[model samples]
Target chain A: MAKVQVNNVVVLDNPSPFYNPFQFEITFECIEDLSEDLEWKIIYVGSAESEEYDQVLDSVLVGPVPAGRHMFVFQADAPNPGLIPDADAVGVTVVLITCTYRGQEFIRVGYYVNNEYTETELRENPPVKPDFSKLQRNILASNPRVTRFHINWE
Target chain B: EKAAXXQRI
Candidate 1:
């Protein structure tokens, strides 16, 4: 299970069912104690709302943002698939680009998380509750994205 | 002469 903190700037003044792309921003801040090598990723998926458009976009090198305030921008392009899917609810592919000091070590880490809601349904009433519980879980969980990683002095 | 016009349907 992937834990994350989502900030919604619109709709009920909170987070919702997850399909309302225009309603919020989901920030997945994570820390790696072992290394500071950052990576870039790109993901593409199809939606019933824009099946013909074939909206493919680039990924970003998220932060080693201090354990304190961690957030990112979600401008309708990077729609969390698990939380938002097309009519088919068909899963999408997430490709992560990893960087390594040595030419030999090129590791790509990727994962997929899903949510059970459709676009139309969300328009009428958003899904995710307007509480910070979801975000709290992400920061406090055993394997959280941020504020939960261990630091190593090397 | 001054005139004021108000249109109502």
Candidate 2:
């Protein structure tokens, strides 16, 4: 089982139609002392109600973090304002932070966008949805070794 | 010997 846990996420910049970009930071901790090196990746998946169409904004990996709290910042931009879904389209964005140890995923943290509004309005008032039920299920299905899961927002 | 798992920046 994996001992890494996602503790918190701080939003440096919220997504906005006008900004053309956004930024955030994540903090993770290890419950037990690590004896070996660890590898992990951060991924952002953007999806419209149509499951077939999903875009990945960013995916990065950094690891071998010492047994303690570690932090990383993510800076990203959507394809374009026109591509962001409107209220009518019911678009959704999911941010996934994962840790893979021993060649298998051991932890996953997911963040979801909740505000229902147009791309123009999302910039001013981007509300994050407060549910990780689906994200937990998805992570548990793929990574049975995951001992901790988190759903956080900025 | 200890191997480095993270990239050295």
Candidate 3:
């Protein structure tokens, strides 16, 4: 049993399943009001044979989320999208979503990608690195907690 | 080029 739960994770695209240059959303609920911020990370899990090479793809800090539910949407560009796995690698590569609060990880989930999609396929589409400056500007524009102030000098 | 690759895949 856990106080927090990852209710949903969706890939904002079509076809067989999740793909590179990824765009997705995650939803979660907390049983009690979280007074502090929660940190989340999305990890690219390498094939079982190459477990040591796991890479962290994206991360974000969201806070003061009162009890109930919240959602986070992300359009991620793999930092090293061109680094495809080895040809001989076996086992599925997965995306692991982990949430932590107060330095303790509370919930986690794993999303599997289509096995048929290979390293070559990933290499072909070099990941478009996320322009974080632009992304932050959009967040500030729509974020309710962040207010725009206009000051007048007389 | 990488963006195009994502489309083909």
Candidate 4:
């Protein structure tokens, strides 16, 4: 049986500069006291073709939670532009927020991130080299993809 | 957006 349930996730500072940090306010409820801390992670997909291009931007341990609701804002630096290919830079990507118990991922929350130029000229005709500073990131909050996995909560 | 999802899929 499931012991924890996600209540809500709020994407903060939407449509901000590409270099800006990504922030998500996560809320969840636990039905029982946990002996160990929950492992939360934020991941960025550098490319859709392979897992090698994926990046784990940040990870945090949210602990010894008693049976009840909990909330926290998780933030991470944006994916390094240098590590991403130019062709995939100015397009849509996926960002994932996942929670795990004892190294077992129990649930995952994903959002679509759209990257585009902030200027009209660049928006119409993008330069060969993507300018990170000129790009903006918009996380589709209303369109989140959530996946729940059956795990041994005990 | 390969095999992408926004939930309710």
Candidate 5:
């Protein structure tokens, strides 16, 4: 049986500038009361080739949940642009939303994100140092990859 | 008791 079901994740402010904040509305249901808080986190991957470049933007706790539906807006500042590789910054990447219970991760949702320059001049010859001001961030929200893990809820 | 499960709809 499932204790918590993440019904959906709604992206916010997508297709905006690279410097724009990252936002999401996570809706979930709790089958029973949860004594501990549900730890939710957002992770950004700078490059698919390397795990070292990944970043955990932020994490929050939603606790002592009663049996019912629940939703919250999870927001975080943009990823540190300096950390992304110059070439990798202009292409597609991924962001992850994970939920943990009792120190165990049982849910993971991944969304694809693409970043490109808004201006043709910059788009044709992107600078080594990405100009976040003119860069647009587009999140592929229509389709998301979700994975579930079995954990001891007791 | 059975363990908890995660799902995608």
Candidate 6:
């Protein structure tokens, strides 16, 4: 099996909407050379203490993201690391990518999490959402045929 | 004493 290619990445959560969590939708494309039974895994990094403690945020294989452009929600949470009492988790990172291949170890997709809150806003755990409209539009315009792949396996 | 038969109970 080959490493799945990230065809599209979508961010969900309306910054203007009511307070919620931040999430991302990642779309992947299967390598033509791989077998149809290929499976993939995702890992996320969000906090430093979580790293020191060697803890991974909960992960599951809901299902494949299908071929071409798709999306998923990367829910963001502010965990309270025991070491830091005065503040919420300052930041988080996404690390590790698991796959079904025997020889393949997880890959690291690092991310930085920050709580950009003032003294008053700190308590609220402000919500920040990433926009992917630009990314999607650019991909569609540049290559239309790229999205016209067969989904016989799915 | 007779040897006890070792078995998973």
Pick the TM-score winner: 4
What DockQ does each prediction reach against the true complex? 0.01, 0.03, 0.03, 0.17, 0.14, 0.01
TM-score per model over all chains: 0.26, 0.50, 0.58, 0.93, 0.91, 0.43
Off by over 4 Å in 5: B1-9
Clashes of 4: 0
User: Sorted by TM-score, highest first, which candidate order results?
Assistant: 4, 5, 3, 2, 6, 1
Could you tell me which 10 consecutive residues in candidate 5 chain A have the lowest summed lDDT?
Answer: A81-90
Candidate 4 local accuracy as lDDT?
Answer: 0.86
Fnat, model by model in order, equals 0.00, 0.00, 0.00, 0.00, 0.18, 0.00
Candidates 4 and 6, the one with greater TM-score: 4
Angstrom error of the Cα, residue A26, model 4: value is 0.6
Clashes of each: 8, 2, 1, 0, 0, 13
For model 4, the stretches where C-alpha displacement exceeds 4 angstroms are: B1-9
lDDT-superior candidate, 1 or 4: 4
Per-residue lDDT for A7-113 in model 5, tens only?
88899988888888899998888999998999999999988989999989988897778999998889988899888877688889999999999999998989889
Model 5: which docking level applies? Answer: incorrect
Cα lDDT tens digits, model 2, A29-139, are: 876766555655545443445544444555445544577888877666533334444441234455555666656665655565433344455545554642121111111
**Number of the candidate with higher DockQ, 3 or 4:** 4
Better of 3 and 4 by lDDT: 4
Q: Top DockQ: which candidate number?
A: 4
Write candidate 4's Cα lDDT for A64-124 as tens digits: 7899989989999999888887877888878999999988999999887889998899999
lDDT of each: 0.30, 0.47, 0.51, 0.86, 0.87, 0.35
> Candidate 6 lDDT, tens digit per residue, A48-122?
333443333434444433444334555544222343322223332223333343334322233323333333543
Q: Which of the two, 1 or 5, has more TM-score?
A: 5
